[PDB]
Amino acid sequence: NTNN
Amino acid sequence: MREVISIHVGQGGIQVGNACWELFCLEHGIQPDGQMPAFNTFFSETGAGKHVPRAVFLDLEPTVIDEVRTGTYRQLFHPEQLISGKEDAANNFARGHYTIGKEIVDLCLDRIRKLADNCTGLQGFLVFNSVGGGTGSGLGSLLLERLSVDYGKKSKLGFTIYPSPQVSTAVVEPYNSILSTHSLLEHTDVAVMLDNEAIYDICRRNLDIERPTYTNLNRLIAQVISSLTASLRFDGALNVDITEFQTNLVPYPRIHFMLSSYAPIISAEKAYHEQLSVAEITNSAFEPANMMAKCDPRHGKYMACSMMYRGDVVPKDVNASIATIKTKRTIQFVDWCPTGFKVGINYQPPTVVPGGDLAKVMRAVCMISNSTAIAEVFSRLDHKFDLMYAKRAFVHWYVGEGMEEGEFSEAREDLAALEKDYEEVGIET
Amino acid sequence: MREVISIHVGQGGIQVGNACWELFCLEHGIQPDGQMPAFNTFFSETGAGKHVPRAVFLDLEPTVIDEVRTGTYRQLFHPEQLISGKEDAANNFARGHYTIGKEIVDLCLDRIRKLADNCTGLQGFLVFNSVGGGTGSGLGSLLLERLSVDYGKKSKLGFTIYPSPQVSTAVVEPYNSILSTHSLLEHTDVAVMLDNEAIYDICRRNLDIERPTYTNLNRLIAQVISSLTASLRFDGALNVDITEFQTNLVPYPRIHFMLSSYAPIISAEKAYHEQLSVAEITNSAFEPANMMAKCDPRHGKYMACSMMYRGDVVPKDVNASIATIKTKRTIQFVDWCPTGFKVGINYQPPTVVPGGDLAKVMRAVCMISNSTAIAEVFSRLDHKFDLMYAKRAFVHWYVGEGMEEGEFSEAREDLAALEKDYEEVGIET
Amino acid sequence: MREIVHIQGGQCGNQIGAKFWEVISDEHGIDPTGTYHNVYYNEATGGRYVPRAILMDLEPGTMDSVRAGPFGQLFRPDNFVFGQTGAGNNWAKGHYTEGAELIDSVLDVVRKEAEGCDCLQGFQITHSLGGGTGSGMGTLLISKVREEYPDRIMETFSVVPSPKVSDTVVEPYNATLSVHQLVENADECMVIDNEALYDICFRTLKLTTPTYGDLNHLVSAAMSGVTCCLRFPGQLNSDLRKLAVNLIPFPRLHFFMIGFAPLTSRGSQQYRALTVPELTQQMFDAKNMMCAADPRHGRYLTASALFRGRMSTKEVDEQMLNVQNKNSSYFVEWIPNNIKSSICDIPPKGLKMAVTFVGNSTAIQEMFKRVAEQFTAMFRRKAFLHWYTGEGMDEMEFTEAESNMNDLVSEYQQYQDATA
Amino acid sequence: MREIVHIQGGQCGNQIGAKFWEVISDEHGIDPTGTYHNVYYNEATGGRYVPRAILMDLEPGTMDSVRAGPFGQLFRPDNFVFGQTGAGNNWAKGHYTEGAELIDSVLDVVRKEAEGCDCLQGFQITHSLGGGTGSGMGTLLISKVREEYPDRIMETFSVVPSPKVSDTVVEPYNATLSVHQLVENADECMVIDNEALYDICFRTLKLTTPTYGDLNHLVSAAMSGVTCCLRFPGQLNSDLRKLAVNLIPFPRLHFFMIGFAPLTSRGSQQYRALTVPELTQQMFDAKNMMCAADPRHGRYLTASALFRGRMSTKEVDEQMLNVQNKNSSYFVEWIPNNIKSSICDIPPKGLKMAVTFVGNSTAIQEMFKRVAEQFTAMFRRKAFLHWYTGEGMDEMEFTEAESNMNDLVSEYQQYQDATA
Ligand SMILES: Nc1nc2c(ncn2[C@@H]2O[C@H](COP(=O)(O)OP(=O)(O)OP(=O)(O)O)[C@@H](O)[C@H]2O)c(=O)[nH]1
Ligand SMILES: Nc1nc2c(ncn2[C@@H]2O[C@H](COP(=O)(O)OP(=O)(O)OP(=O)(O)O)[C@@H](O)[C@H]2O)c(=O)[nH]1
Ligand SMILES: Nc1nc2c(ncn2[C@@H]2O[C@H](COP(=O)(O)OP(=O)(O)O)[C@@H](O)[C@H]2O)c(=O)[nH]1
Ligand SMILES: Nc1nc2c(ncn2[C@@H]2O[C@H](COP(=O)(O)OP(=O)(O)O)[C@@H](O)[C@H]2O)c(=O)[nH]1
Ligand SMILES: [Mg+2]
Ligand SMILES: [Mg+2]
């Protein structure tokens, strides 16, 4: 995902 | 010159109806388009070309009726037998019995009347209602009462998905189940208690599928329905017309709650190593473990037992097997019914569902048992009711929809008065 | 029309049963595929081609049952007649007779009932269980009690593997052997004591193989069992049913612990060399070197001898040889049994299992004997019991499983009484 | 046909709303321009879709906030109502004098929005309970709309103040004054507190620098899962009302707890094959819920679980039975079978299995107990009370609010301790 | 099916357990990535395998080890429950003061891992006896879990220090403290020392510099060969309870000695046979065991022999009977046939046979004696006591602990004197  | 009318109210009803119409269409050679590449009992020709089914599909959540409106059978049902409202039942009886259905019953009854106007040899009705829910409970009981005050003499069966004994699918179930049972006491002549707990067990053990789903459940329910209706539908050396059950299995006017069973529900392998004659098939049919409902018939008496055989069956073995099964001492009947057996024969072997877990076999039996052990189920269910009515839990969601509160009391007590019958009839003369 | 049930409980029981079923499939000419290219006694035809064997396999450890489910015979047996538990027996009798024994024995009784209903002229039961084991004693005794209270008149003949007086494969054999002996004393009509040591010196003196393995032992026991059941299986000049045995060799309903013997037992190196005459084969059958139980028959006095001949057999020289044996001073019967020999003849030689260290030969004698010297075994075995119950060794492992502590005493006491009778018979009048 | 308007309020409510709308656009395959690639969105000329939401706040900062973030052009300017001052962390400045002159206008933008639907299933609110703007305006609006449409239900996706890690000094007054009114005209007060969110994002994903975007995204996922079983077909369908019926036994024990599953980091992502019992063990763990209240310290009055994806319903029901039966102490006796299930048919974006757990449980009275503790400690000295009593508020309403709070917690305790 | 859990605490426990997981992975054919090239492993997505194990310590330095040594990517990232202070060689720091704070989290992980089983056959733990982390936390965990799962049984491979090798100067204290309750609620205490391993790798394998690597490898291979007969088909199968009857005559006389066979160096490996006679001559001596207690100065109450490979049961049986009735004096006479054998069908990786010799003897009682010796000379003067009582632990306990030891050793000597 777009965690970081 | 002989046919039925099936109603599938609520959420479970439409599911089992989807599976059952699948099975019927794929038995009679009727394509999912309604065109052919016996059906007078279920389908009807629109003058030429395509078949249309005899059914009505009610619900209030537009979800399932839409899913079947654009599923695989989008072009089979007449678009006027799919009645969906706007709001939802929300598991409270009064929502589908006083406010919402208050006018939807008008359209439903007008459509049922227009259907019956076309039927020529109508025998009875086959409703389908998961009483644990809201709409199948409330609207179902309202429709039952409306039909019983409208037509009358026509028989009225039913296939209710009661709440399981142990596993939980809702919390307000003992309310809208007791209300439906009290409103179903007299208008319905035949109640066939189905419970998703025993069939999960079966699918786990006999069908060897460890991770079952309502799809397989409903496949099996459709198989039971078809094995029961094969008498009317196709030929048989000894046929029964559903008005048979209305008089063989209803001794006293109030008590008619029975349980069903089927055999042999066996996988491919577990039947490949099996002779599987009438003897074993009927000695397994009586087995309390694989009953569709959930109870312990070994702890109660039997009162009446219908058995419809289908497939290439030899009658001598039927007679001898019923003799030896009445010989047993663990299975005993009540004093007031010595001839506690009913049989029927149909020459149509069971049809397999293409892509179904059930295995193909020549001989099959379907058993409809009016027993007296199922009594305890009500008690157990009634038990739950008390543990909720002791503090008037969840009652405001019911009194808010016009339902008079006292109703609960009446039902809860009057259903308990039903016990006065059961625990009496289990006593010999 | 006439047949036998085959039960295999425990570890050694199931391995020797695997060997026995290999031999049975081989003799009649049945392939491990179930398809074949007399079997009514053992097999049952599955309507079209395949055959299911009358058998149940009880063991609470999955390992051996998993092996047979994934061995070379995965296709033959019915997928339900392989009943496996989930935990070991751990050689403490109470584990397989009180705690978990209550869990699976009901399933065994269900399966046995469903397997016997599909039979007509069932005669007996042939259970197979080492007594030294945990489940071979606990579960075996529980099953035997269930069958006794269930059927009754049906004969029952176990084939138990009693521990050798010298060789030891466990350290708690006395306990869970005394317990199962006291249980089986009144249930199984004919218990043939099959030891596990004397077979080693047998296969070292006759087959001349120095390092034998359990599989050879099981093949030899399978040969004995087939030589026994050949009468009901096949035809012959003197058919002797199974209900014959418990009629000839049970003088008093309590003393029935018989020891067996088999001949000819010879590998190929001297097969063509030695002549193997009927006289010499029945002479080798009686020499105390090759009795399966570790006993010197000369110590006591015989009480009954059933000799079953199969193959090419000439009755005149048979009677002459039996007469010579009766005149031998090394062997003698008790006074009160003048007619000591019962004889049966068949019309079929043995068959050879590819890999079986035995050799093919036209004639075979299996001789079972109810004798007196076997008593001493119990004595010496009982010996060990003292040197354990004098210090309550290992007792807490039993008392922790529900079994009453002092119960041992009773069992021990009872065996003493058994020994009592084994001296009340050897005395003259 | 069962539509849902999405009213917001305050800066936190507005940020949560923007995050939720962009996540829903992700699920329903919309792009940040509103083109495909009726329950939530509305059709608009040229195949465009616009969310059915209004956005209210006193300070125009949140306006530029919801403009800056992606998917900010989905909304319509007719639903951007905004004051000028900002209540600046003062409750009464968003409930009596300054907030009032906005709510009227907001009523208009609701009345030409609700009737736009034909069968409205109910509202849903997203705001804070401590900030003056969000709390005050949302409370007044709940009042007005419950007066208007009493038949529909109004979920309040509320974020209660961080109990121990406080960022402002006037939380307890605002929280108490707001809850006193929320307990009347609300139906689903699902509480969230940043303590539990930081706990989860630290000790369950080992993340580096948790900003408010990640917490908003997580609450967004939970919010979506709450009603996705309605948005889509399923083997056993539910809605916003079946939940209410199966979750509250009395008209004021309607304060919930929220939990999401599954949640792991790359290290743990490599391991732990995905299967329903693992999901159950993850959802029914204590620290895996949006509320800083160890649920073991109370009993579960009732709890529903919505699954998303394809599975075996027998496994779902059997796991539910096993978990309600083995830990019978933590569950309540006088009600049987107190767990509820539902199953959808379309899981989230690339997530084969997803569980959303909503539970009415008496283990959350501790939160109100400690908030009222802070309140009564700061009120015995009349501290920071002039800021309120200068704006028409009296000192009796505070005592009424605290007494109502204590009556609510006493109801929880009393009908937790009951038996049969 | 008959699955087993793995707890490994303390420095030595963790080292030996890592080596044991290495040997098992090389036996089941599992490369360090968790692929093939339920008794011990669990399945995971993509056919990956997770070892069922929990690693605990009060100082996370051991993390380095379990991440540096081979097979470090196998374990679960949630199964590393680590402290921060470190018990620092003191028992109190790991059983009353600090270990009493993470032992609950270890219990939670144990519950989350055991419920995933369907038939839990038993427990096995590995730890030191003086190591504060190891002894303290392991003993506390044993206490808790046996108070939790009374049906299941624990088989701990604790590694006692023998005084012939000097490691630390406070061992006797922690040793006796852990023994006070290790004889209480543990059913198979297979003791291991270091002097035995040094003597082995010097005068039995001719190794040059006996290093911890090969010592741990040997003890881990023995640990595997102990229970292997359940991991595969066998002719006379066993489990962790068929030993729990054949080898525990009394609920406390359960202290086991371990021996492995065969053991030789390269040249010796070339020029010798591998048969029942040679393996038997190799295993019944004194210096093929892992206990610095000369067994020929005592007796064996019972002795199990788990063979591995393939052979003729008559051969091993006659060899057992012969070695018994020739060593009639060194065996106990008041019990009959005190020996047991058990044969599997699959030899280990590398050879064609294997022999694990487990013994419930009456010789290792003397071991306790010598340890008790030091105890008195460290208690009569109350030496080094100002590190224990200063952590809540009441001194009185110590006294009665020693008393308990007496009973234990007394029993052994008493049973060495029994006749018939
Ligand atoms: N045999 C079978 N039972 C089902 C199925 N789906 C649901 N059920 C059962 O029906 C009950 C669910 O209640 P619902 O019927 O959905 O409630 P409702 O009356 O329809 O009210 P609304 O959802 O608002 O329409 C549960 O007891 C289910 O176990 C199915 O597909 N097959
Ligand atoms: N004749 C013969 N005896 C065997 C064989 N295998 C094992 N035995 C005997 O089995 C006895 C060991 O006890 P078990 O039968 O294994 O114990 P159990 O009751 O089956 O249950 P478990 O403890 O789980 O094995 C020993 O006396 C063996 O001699 C075999 O293949 N042939
Ligand atoms: N998850 C989340 N919590 C917030 C956010 N903003 C504020 N909070 C917390 O909510 C409380 C104040 O709410 P706030 O929105 O600043 O008050 P408002 O200006 O009246 O709307 C404080 O405890 C903040 O820490 C946000 O953007 N996301
Ligand atoms: N066979 C072996 N024993 C060890 C090893 N390391 C330590 N031991 C023993 O373990 C004893 C104490 O246990 P330990 O776990 O090291 O203490 P702690 O970790 O500080 O609590 C030490 O006195 C050592 O004798 C090793 O690598 N191999
Ligand atoms: Mg429904
Ligand atoms: Mg066994």
Side-chain angles (χ1 to χ4, degrees), chain E residues 9-16 57-59 62 86-90 127-135 159 161 165-168 171 192-194 197 211-213 215-216 219:
Chain E
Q11 267 180 21
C12 176
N14 290 314
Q15 185 83 260
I16 283 177
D57 192 288
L58 300 201
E59 61 183 2
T62 70
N89 202 26
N90 175 22
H127 57 280
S128 160
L129 278 304
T133 80
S135 160
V159 295
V165 174
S166 297
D167 200 289
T168 59
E171 284 302 294
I192 292 94
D193 43 3
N194 269 334
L197 299 193
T211 321
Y212 282 168
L215 273 45
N216 299 325
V219 59

Side-chain angles (χ1 to χ4, degrees), chain C residues 11 59 61 135:
Chain C
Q11 155 87 47
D59 205 340
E61 47 186 350
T135 185

Side-chain angles (χ1 to χ4, degrees), chain C residues 7-29:
Chain C
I7 305 190
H8 298 281
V9 304
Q11 155 87 47
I14 291 185
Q15 309 254 321
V16 76
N18 177 23
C20 183
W21 282 104
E22 170 165 1
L23 179 54
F24 286 172
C25 307
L26 212 68
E27 197 170 355
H28 285 120

Side-chain angles (χ1 to χ4, degrees), chain B residues 31-172:
Chain B
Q31 281 191 226
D33 292 7
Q35 312 195 351
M36 191 152 45
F39 41 75
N40 191 29
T41 82
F42 279 104
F43 306 165
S44 67
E45 292 291 45
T46 174
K50 68 183 288 185
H51 306 264
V52 307
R54 285 191 184 81
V56 295
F57 288 165
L58 320 176
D59 205 304
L60 311 181
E61 44 199 2
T63 80
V64 283
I65 292 177
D66 195 327
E67 201 197 350
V68 71
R69 264 152 152 174
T70 185
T72 320
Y73 302 131
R74 98 189 66 85
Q75 193 178 2
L76 179 53
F77 311 90
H78 186 290
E80 198 193 354
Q81 301 114 11
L82 321 174
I83 317 303
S84 192
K86 311 302 213 56
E87 302 276 300
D88 298 331
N91 306 56
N92 65 296
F93 191 89
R95 190 53 182 283
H97 188 284
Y98 288 132
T99 77
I100 289 291
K102 195 174 212 143
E103 70 274 40
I104 320 299
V105 301
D106 203 338
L107 193 152
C108 189
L109 290 178
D110 283 338
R111 268 306 308 191
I112 282 290
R113 166 76 77 178
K114 256 185 54 189
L115 268 185
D117 213 8
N118 189 27
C119 317
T120 172
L122 202 158
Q123 311 294 323
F125 308 132
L126 279 72
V127 306
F128 286 90
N129 46 0
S130 82
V131 305
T135 181
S137 197
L139 181 51
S141 296
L142 190 42
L143 208 61
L144 277 177
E145 291 147 332
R146 287 305 275 267
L147 262 67
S148 198
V149 302
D150 187 298
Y151 293 76
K153 67 181 291 294
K154 310 301 283 289
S155 178
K156 290 177 263 322
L157 278 74
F159 291 80
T160 80
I161 316 302
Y162 268 15
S164 65
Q166 209 176 10
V167 301
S168 196
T169 174
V171 291
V172 74

Side-chain angles (χ1 to χ4, degrees), chain B residues 97-324:
Chain B
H97 188 284
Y98 288 132
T99 77
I100 289 291
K102 195 174 212 143
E103 70 274 40
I104 320 299
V105 301
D106 203 338
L107 193 152
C108 189
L109 290 178
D110 283 338
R111 268 306 308 191
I112 282 290
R113 166 76 77 178
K114 256 185 54 189
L115 268 185
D117 213 8
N118 189 27
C119 317
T120 172
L122 202 158
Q123 311 294 323
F125 308 132
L126 279 72
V127 306
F128 286 90
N129 46 0
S130 82
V131 305
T135 181
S137 197
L139 181 51
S141 296
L142 190 42
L143 208 61
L144 277 177
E145 291 147 332
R146 287 305 275 267
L147 262 67
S148 198
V149 302
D150 187 298
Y151 293 76
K153 67 181 291 294
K154 310 301 283 289
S155 178
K156 290 177 263 322
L157 278 74
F159 291 80
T160 80
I161 316 302
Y162 268 15
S164 65
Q166 209 176 10
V167 301
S168 196
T169 174
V171 291
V172 74
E173 211 153 16
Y175 280 97
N176 58 322
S177 178
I178 284 302
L179 304 201
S180 158
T181 298
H182 155 58
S183 194
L184 185 145
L185 216 65
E186 59 275 12
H187 320 85
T188 298
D189 306 336
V190 182
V192 182
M193 305 309 187
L194 270 43
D195 312 299
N196 299 335
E197 206 290 327
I199 311 193
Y200 276 169
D201 262 348
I202 295 185
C203 294
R204 197 261 322 282
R205 45 197 284 164
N206 295 15
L207 314 184
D208 301 270
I209 57 183
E210 177 79 355
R211 275 76 180 267
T213 290
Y214 292 93
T215 64
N216 299 320
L217 169 46
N218 293 19
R219 296 289 175 87
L220 195 151
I221 305 306
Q223 208 77 59
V224 165
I225 281 286
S226 181
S227 160
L228 188 138
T229 317
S231 51
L232 275 70
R233 283 208 271 95
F234 267 93
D235 170 76
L238 178 48
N239 79 323
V240 302
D241 275 328
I242 64 178
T243 306
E244 186 75 31
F245 313 110
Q246 199 260 13
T247 188
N248 270 335
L249 317 171
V250 196
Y252 294 159
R254 185 183 281 178
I255 47 165
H256 37 79
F257 313 120
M258 323 188 284
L259 73 163
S260 86
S261 288
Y262 186 97
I265 43 180
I266 301 283
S267 296
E269 283 313 279
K270 291 208 47 182
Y272 167 57
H273 319 273
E274 195 79 44
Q275 168 68 10
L276 209 66
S277 161
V278 164
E280 195 289 328
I281 215 173
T282 188
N283 287 97
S284 168
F286 263 58
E287 169 60 40
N290 71 315
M291 304 296 266
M292 299 303 111
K294 206 43 183 51
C295 74
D296 52 354
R298 288 167 302 103
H299 283 162
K301 288 171 178 288
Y302 271 58
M303 269 167 42
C305 182
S306 297
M307 300 171 59
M308 277 59 71
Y309 286 50
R310 60 165 311 153
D312 290 331
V313 181
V314 303
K316 195 272 156 183
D317 269 298
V318 177
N319 198 358
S321 277
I322 309 168
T324 74

Side-chain angles (χ1 to χ4, degrees), chain C residues 309-328:
Chain C
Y309 281 137
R310 48 182 294 177
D312 164 88
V313 162
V314 286
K316 158 71 164 303
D317 204 358
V318 163
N319 291 27
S321 48
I322 295 186
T324 73
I325 297 300
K326 185 167 294 189
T327 49
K328 306 283 139 57

Side-chain angles (χ1 to χ4, degrees), chain C residues 10-12 59-61 63-64 88-91 130 133-136, chain E residues 237 242:
Chain C
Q11 155 87 47
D59 205 340
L60 266 53
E61 47 186 350
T63 180
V64 168
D88 267 353
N91 308 64
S130 88
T135 185
Chain E
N237 276 272
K242 286 177 79 70

Side-chain angles (χ1 to χ4, degrees), chain B residues 63 88 91 168 170 200 387, chain D residues 119 237 239 242 313 334 337 339:
Chain B
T63 80
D88 298 331
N91 306 56
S168 196
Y200 276 169
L387 261 66
Chain D
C119 303
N237 306 7
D239 55 38
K242 296 169 56 66
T313 82
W334 62 259
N337 63 84
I339 197 164

